[PDB]
Write a protein that binds this ligand. Sequence first.
Ligand SMILES: Cc1ccc(-c2cc(C(=O)O)c3c(c2)ncn3Cc2ccncc2)c(Cl)c1
Ligand SMILES: [Mg+2]
Ligand SMILES: [Zn+2]
Length: 361
Amino acid sequence: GASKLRAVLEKLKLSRDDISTAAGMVKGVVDHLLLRLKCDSAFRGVGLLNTGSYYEHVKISAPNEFDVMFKLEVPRIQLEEYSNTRAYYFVKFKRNPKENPLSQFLEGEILSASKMLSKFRKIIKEEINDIKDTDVIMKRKRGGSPAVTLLISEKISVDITLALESKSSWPASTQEGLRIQNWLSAKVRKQLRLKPFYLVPKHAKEGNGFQEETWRLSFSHIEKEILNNHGKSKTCCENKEEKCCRKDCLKLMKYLLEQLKERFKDKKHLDKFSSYHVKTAFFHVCTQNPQDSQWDRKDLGLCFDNCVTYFLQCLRTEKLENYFIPEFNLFSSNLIDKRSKEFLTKQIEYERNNEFPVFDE
Ligand SMILES: Cc1ccc(-c2cc(C(=O)O)c3c(c2)ncn3Cc2ccncc2)c(Cl)c1
Ligand SMILES: [Mg+2]
Ligand SMILES: [Zn+2]
């Protein structure tokens, strides 16, 4: 039962050495690139964004795949929303106080996402050869993705995303997002919405191409902020009396998708699904279940089934709201095709009705 799930979780622990030394390798490379990007006129204000819930600059998103975010302070920034997509925006500036560093990537009033992403790639690619200490190479895509992808010693992959940092009020499309009021308090929502926010150069799907001057709102850095301060009680998991299973349910949810994605590797039906989809549904279940008593460590198997059922429902209805932007459907037909969503529903349906045989040893 939940005995199986506690055992899954015990075995996940055993591979923390591998992820930790992998993440140190990523940390090295990342620091070297940060040194050089700072040499450039355009990126001298660049720095690493603290996003990871265990490792500072390195978020883990797959067994051998890491996510790192470089942030760039871009002051006096004005947002024009692309075609009511809610998540995708054109970036302009307020005036010409004094000509800014980034003016090389302007096109009229608009800052091109692809033009700035392109000089980002060039600087990384030139630095990727020089330090022979470790063999790292670049990988393909560059299509409707903000990520520049390195492969380190042929095993470890790291996605590097440029992120404009805006200190302004969050845009209106997030007005009704981050619905933590009943869980973490209205006071905590007010403070989190005072933190900055980010724009990453992911490009909207237009027709069968991309609109590659659009940026996408990013709130990745809020995750650590809630994962590690996750209870209704400020002292949740700080003493032996308040031990919940919120973190273990998220760990189990990610592992479930990882295993399923590994098993349907033959015909790639599940390519488009990622741990981001699982985190989003998880935090939506923390919203439905706001009391620390709804996540007692003794109830692990039922809290897990709460998470799998909500995820299942999102797949069946083809609707998973962006946690920060409610009108942005992570599961729209535009983003994931209808056959894939159907495919995962059948598999997660099956796993759940059979007490997760994918977890068997
Ligand atoms: C409470 C809470 C806090 C943060 C996130 C969150 C947000 C973002 C985001 O940038 O929007 C995340 C994220 C987690 N992992 C990755 N990305 C970035 C991203 C960008 C484009 N496509 C997919 C993913 C969630 Cl889901 C819940
Ligand atoms: Mg331990
Ligand atoms: Zn807790």
